[model samples]
Target chain A: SGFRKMAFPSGKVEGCMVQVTCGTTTLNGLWLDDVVYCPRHVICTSEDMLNPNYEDLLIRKSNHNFLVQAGNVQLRVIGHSMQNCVLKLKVDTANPKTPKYKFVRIQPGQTFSVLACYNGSPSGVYQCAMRPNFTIKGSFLNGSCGSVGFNIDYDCVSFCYMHHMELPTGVHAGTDLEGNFYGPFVDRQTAQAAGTDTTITVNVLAWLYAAVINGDRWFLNRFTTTLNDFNLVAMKYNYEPLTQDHVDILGPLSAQTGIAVLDMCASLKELLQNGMNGRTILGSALLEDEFTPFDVVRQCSGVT
Target chain B: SGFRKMAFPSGKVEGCMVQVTCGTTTLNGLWLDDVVYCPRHVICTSEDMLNPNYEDLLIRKSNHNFLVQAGNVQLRVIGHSMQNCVLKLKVDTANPKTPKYKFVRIQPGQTFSVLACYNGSPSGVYQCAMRPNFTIKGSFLNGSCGSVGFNIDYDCVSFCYMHHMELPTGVHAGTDLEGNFYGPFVDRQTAQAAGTDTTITVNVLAWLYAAVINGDRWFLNRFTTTLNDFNLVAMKYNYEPLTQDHVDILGPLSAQTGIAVLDMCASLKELLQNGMNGRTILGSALLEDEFTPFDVVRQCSGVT
Candidate 1:
């Protein structure tokens, strides 16, 4: 029976959004926390404030991200601010079962980061929402929380595509106005802190759930795969390169094959279809032109 | 383009709801048939549908009945008027990829039955819905036409409790008051005439899609085991004897030992208890249960 009082004391901020945060430390445990919204009218209008898809998210993340499967992750609420105030963290592995997850009870003028280990598997399309109550035993106030939807493949460390490649520092993976890759990061950390992450989680869940009910496997798979891929890339920023494995796995290949078999298959398929054959190759020729392995032009051309 | 029309005269009472039926003989390579339901609504729904809790009924039949797992043995369906229908079937094992399935279609007055094979180790719960427009192209409708939720564990037949178990003569497996099992063949010939033996190709993709979203291994195991226990006594009316393997699988010794182990280490406290007790006594209990299985006396004594 862990109950705590929550507030949304913004007296004059009209249309200011609100969010709810929940965290679970126990195995199969859930902690519903307070709802933090600026306006009263929009309290339950948010879909995440309703039936939160926790089980589905956990299952999807665990199946795709090996780290989540091996390491227990905890989601926590950081504050009363409707922005940049949630933290989804993994407990230290040394004491895996009883994770000592630290949560920062968000207060005025406080900023916290939400970190989730993303997996690049197709199952990485789980949405997260704020808890309806302050504890597991509390009743859920339907439609009274904020949410975010994300793909583990693009967000998780294990699923990143930029592992062996170079990427711009401020760039992040996200679709744009025309639903195309607009720029590096979806926005600056400050803007993202404001509401994007939470919005993304909520919107993704709404679409995914509807798709699931409608049995749209193809759409579900594509969206999930894209999300996971993005998660993996984001996680790469926090990862350090491994010395021993790098030399062992990549040294020979770099000198000889350079590109892996899958990479070669991709390039070969493009070349055969676009350059040599009279078929519409995947994507645009510009993508194929930009794709090269170690500047080895002849090798990539399949001349050797 | 493949649509066909039929017209009926006003004076044709005809004793049955419908006369002519349409169906496809080939099912890829599986021994199944493809019969279409009414264009949109063939499903019967009533406010007072009789919902039968078979699990509770089995428990009433035998207090010893403990559930391991029980659910849809397969995503199955039945006509409102054909519980007594007898079916003749054949197996096709030559081509696993696309087996041939053939069956006759039943019209309005006639009945239809469906059976799907449920592999015991499914990831989640799923539902079956009508997919009349799933062709080589896209589909007009996306989600379940009239989907009904079902448990996956019950679908696996190898050791399921529902196999050869007695069900109320005219009730569907999971029906409510107004929608209980609604058919029983007046005679075997009548059952066959209603197209009993004809098999329909189960849309595996659709099934898997639904299953992956709602699967839980532990839940599935519980369902199957519970059904097994019910089958022990419930088979009298169905007139089928439990197999020797089935008996051994659900014997008192097996239940006691397995349950003991699960209860002991299922939670954090139980895990700690096991750790503190060490390997000597705990290991001995596990082995003893297997070797000298518990008897009725032990079962009665072990009850709270």
Candidate 2:
């Protein structure tokens, strides 16, 4: 129920302008009162917007010459002018001081695409813009595009992963994957904003559940890494280490139910304490290296 | 392969005679040189036989008026006399001094039966003779009924239990029962002749296997007692205690194989240190007070 309506500033703009902010902080070099009116003058910045609730504001006439479409992973620019124009793209993320741009000549009916890669960091909402310039005055349309645009919010990416990968299995954004049902987080943001112990536990469990069912070693590696990270967080929090009582509780339950409790517990413990590069403790805990453990977890979790 | 032929002493007795001995020791009031030829001069003694190889010798002519049979739990006496004769029965096990006998009269062409209850002690061979004392000479036929009799050697009971209860499932006398494999004694005598640790372990496992399959609580009680006795012997021999490794090995095996390894191991350890008279450790180890464990062991052991 964390919902809010956007409140824009009052009064009409005297010139073409753009503003992006989270609460009181400005972003993408859009200052409190910067404005430009000529097609030759372009505004861009390579800055990351790090607000929990940021919004974009574009001030221009309805005759803008460019159209824009934004998706979570990519952005598109469409040329609506009758003549060819020079289109410029700016990605302002990691190095805001020296913003980078790529120029492309777009025909009247052609479109251009830009791919935003965060280089393995948690994806963010990219503030990208397209500018068009021509030799003749009044030749370029102002604010012809529908409205200001931004890529999908980063929280949506994580939320989508949780919804698509885990919710169907009755494990939601918050809750313990193993026995001793623990959490149903206050919200998805709370879950993602927490330390790696919580996030990694959730992500690894979901991926492990999938990988085990599909027999994919690739995802298994991911699970191992995330598990190790989780273990680090757990150690930081001084969480209790795995004990004989834990093993005892899981043993008979696994056996009678055909669940891979021993292997799961051992794997978690090994990766947690020894890191991903360490030798697997699963060898000693698993009954066999065949399809047995995989088949057991699959059957137990009711995965087809 | 513990077998031997009986060697009788070279001598001639004018009357019918019987010899009873546990190994080389005489029993039931029959001395090495006491030769009786009449009913009024009955010989009796109280003695217990603890030998693993106790034998009964019945010596008489083809015309003897009595037939005798001995088993581990019961002794039978049959009368073949054509005229009425007084039959006396004596059992020398716990108390051999006050020889007690029941007198029953056999009518002409009739037979009398005597039930010898050993009061739960291991049975022994008794030296019994039938004396027909009438006003007529030669009224007592020499050995008329039979010259051969058999005693219930101690090993048959244990052997019979093993064969009838375990062998059908392929567990047999000297192979693995489930995951843990143990033994095969050479013979019943050899089996009982072993140290209490080995015998107790073998017997408890066999009975436990049977009781688990049949859902028989009665046999489960017996198994508990035997397990306690086994622990006592194990302690005496300095056997190792159950450890985490034991639990780890069994946990996954039980889950994958549908075996009750956890419950079995837990019960064993609990009963081992706690003794049988203490509160039962079965409450936590068993799945239910119902027939699930029984059914599982039954299907696993191939019992119908």
Candidate 3:
């Protein structure tokens, strides 16, 4: 009882890339219209002859970013100036019931920009990641459609050095490539009001993730501090200023303190090490002059 | 240049089971005394007969919990109730530099007990999990040994159900089999002081992981809430009482808000689905009568 006559079916998507891109008023950007192979909403790929129906998707003048997906439905593009596609949309979902994510076979040196924010006003919070190439899975958490919208921009660059302060793995806080410092993990640790205390835990995780990739010890003395909700990404972009708290938290050059949650920090570190090493661009450290937090990377790509 | 004597070495570990159990005062637990193959420290297994070096280690009154590690050192318990283990202590680490974790092979229904704490006041924080058995890797994030301690207990259970509230995935919060409530994502929300915020992010992740396994929806309105530092594990054990905050966060009963984390939530969900489902005890749900948050499971074990 599942069938769709559109160009994009479910199963082996191979062709030009198809992306959903509309506008702010109407709403666009790649979106998963529905669950894959929703019996009521189908995407059986083995079916045939896909045509091009630009419902709300965008076509690039630049070689089709071909072979993409619409909503949870994947579209494979064949030759024909244009043709499209997926797994029969078996209502296939990861077993653990986590947030829906996208599995991407990225090449090293690819940077991804993701929208970051929930319905909390002043939207437009975003996260940028320069990652290794592999059958990597990803998903954006901060947009209107959030998981549904599946909005993202992929840019492939040749070189970049993710810098960090030199410290030991014990220090969970540190300075980024830009000399900005962070930590005291609670994210809004000393906040008097709601929006003031800022620590984008994910960004910090990102920073820490990157640090591990490059083998830079950017954190402070230990992992036992709480953070304020001060957004490091925001601070990097100049939304706020560096406060004394940032520097003060770093005082523990000793080994006594750390943030309270054990597994959160514990598993995070181990997972990073085990998961990202393969097919990743982690060891981007190119030269000797590079100090702590200085993670360097190089890449190469072209058009078909 | 990196080497050690005694029994355990850094090569192929294929003997019996070995374990660490010093005690509360002497620190009798499996701990990664130092990073594996620490230049000065060592654990070379391949070389010879690993005599019982009980220097703070415990020999099983039962069959040797052989083939274990002292610190980060892998010990291969061979015949003679001896022999001991690793990957050349490769200084070998995952490229991305994640936390130091263990790679284990779990079966269909095995449970893991991990020490859960750091220097925080409550020293005996522990996490108990009934999981799928396979070559699953794990680590204890809490406890003095935290990453270094690697404290854990492995058990195989034959039956049980990890129940849930049977809601849609959108609700980022949920109740357990006991009908107890939780939500408003930010763990320490509404608290005027510290230590009161009781949301154990990792436990929530675990609950969600189990939910995904059994396909149950246990969360509340959305993922957009900030919780107080109230501990769920503590609550489950009667360490604290459920408060107004728990009931209030679940109020939406509608789909409007969610916790602000995009990737953390998104990835956490997806990872659970992708990572744990394999060789995992996820689909342990049995019988249709079982409701949400009410996950069911079955497993078997032996005494070699």
Candidate 4:
């Protein structure tokens, strides 16, 4: 029951040519015909039936090994100029078990284009061979041209967390600023069974916090620079000088607690007459204290 | 000599009665008269001219004993009901060097009410006698009726910080949250000589930080209750469920440096199927850590 049932008029003769009128336009078709059609009624054609001059209509080059130079073709992929890289493209049809594909002998520096109707399914994976030589096949499907594109199936697709794949340093692949990670899993059920986004976010945040509290100069310095820039902007705007707003934007700029440092500085200033009393100067204190401005700036920046 | 000079008609006798017209009214008087007059014009009379039935106009009892009942008499003070308390009221003229006072023998349980303007000067101290024959002095100024209430002068007056006075238990008067005492001096000049309000605020903040970091439960507990309330409200609103906004509002609720607790909590949820894997539960960690929700809440609340 994968295909829908079609109804014919009463007294319609079987195996007879019927003239179908749709809005003054008449179409001639055989009743009980074996020819399958797509949602848009695009007649599916085999690779041999495709016109050789179909390359003229293709305008774009997809990563697939097919030329979309003209005619009904919509995507093109070119062979490697230097390496003997074999190029191939596969098209699928309505039948889940069987599919159709087309191939081209792309010489070095040559191109191949594909037509939209090659794979007539509404949504199907079009395969391409990028390595050694691979055979190409095609299949008929009840689909449209809009779904055909390069790597279209991969868009918004989630894969399970790859244990072996190391994320680019400091970059937690799918996480946002709030420490939310999308997935390595396809569905939330599987993701939940595995873990939640918060787990990863927490671990990352904990690591970042440890790095800061431990006075990791490399991490602290990076955020300090950012905080300095934030401070400059804050100064320009005449906002509360050395406030949390800057840190909130930057994330983990300083090791010392954000509000406490400012409080301490203010307190020190109050105690001293000429900005420094018996023990230390304000500048030195901020620079050298256990929870220095560096720590505040770093922590506030919120960098992990 | 005390009166001002005015010009008369030509060839007019100096001692002759003169006709004066002012807007359809005419009057005659000797020009060199030196009699002084006030609004109430309580003619200065000795005890001989005093009226006995002067109680009719007085509605309330003042400590001073004089009668506004008749004959332009103004102020009154009453004696103590039980003890032999003497009551006296003083009136002063423009001369600060000399003050004139009158005393009243207030019988026990009697009331006295005073009318204003007994002291003629714009600013002067009118004195009265209170318990055990002690004198009660009140200062009068040309200020409006709004300033005439009993003990009004004490309202805006700031006495110098007294060394002997003990601040109420748990109250650190003139000190910041850090319990850094400000002054035992008399005025703002001395306080400024020591430090400003900023100093006090900072010391208090520093003290809070120390308490939190050290896991001082007494200080921390005061604030955790508040943080719990904040969490409840946040849950009600659904505003950024897992955000530093909570931490920012609550102050430092967790011990892992501060920024990472919530982040870690969120991250952990993202990774595990159950709750936390090994390290800690979010609730237990926040509540039981060195710096619990208590410390954060207390510090944020700016509690003493």
TM-score of each: 0.20, 0.17, 0.21, 0.13
Give the docking tier of candidate 2.
incorrect
Off by over 4 Å in 3: A1-25, A29-112, A116-304, B1-241, B253-304
Candidate 1: where are CA atoms >4 Å away?
A1-146, A150-304, B1-304
Lowest lDDT block of 10, candidate 1 chain A: A1-10
lDDT of 2 by residue, B1-304 (tens): 0000111110111011232222222211110111111111111111321222111221221223222222222222222111111113332222212122211222111111111111111111111111111000000011111111111111110000101001211112211111111232321222222222211222233223333433334313223333344446456534433334433433433554344543454344454455444121211122111112222232233220
Cα shift from native, residue A183, model 3 (Å):
36
The sequence of per-residue lDDT tens digits that candidate 3 reaches over residues B1-304 is 0000001010111011123321221111121212221100012122211332322232322223222344345444322221121111222222231223344432222232222122211111111232211111121111222111111212211111111111121111111212122222111112222123223333333334333332343332232322232333334422223234423432221112232333224433333334433222221211111111111111101000
| Best-matching candidate per TM-score | 3
lDDT of 1 by residue, A1-304 (tens): 0000111111111111122222221111111222221111121223532343433333333311211122124223232221221223222222222212222232111111111111211100111122111111111111211211111111121111110101132112222111122122221122321112211222122222222222322221211123233334323422112223322333333345333333322333333233422222121111111111211121122110
DockQ of every candidate: 0.02, 0.00, 0.01, 0.01
Fnat of candidate 1 is 0.00
Ranking by lDDT: 3, 2, 4, 1
i-RMS, each model, one decimal: 32.6, 48.1, 27.6, 52.1
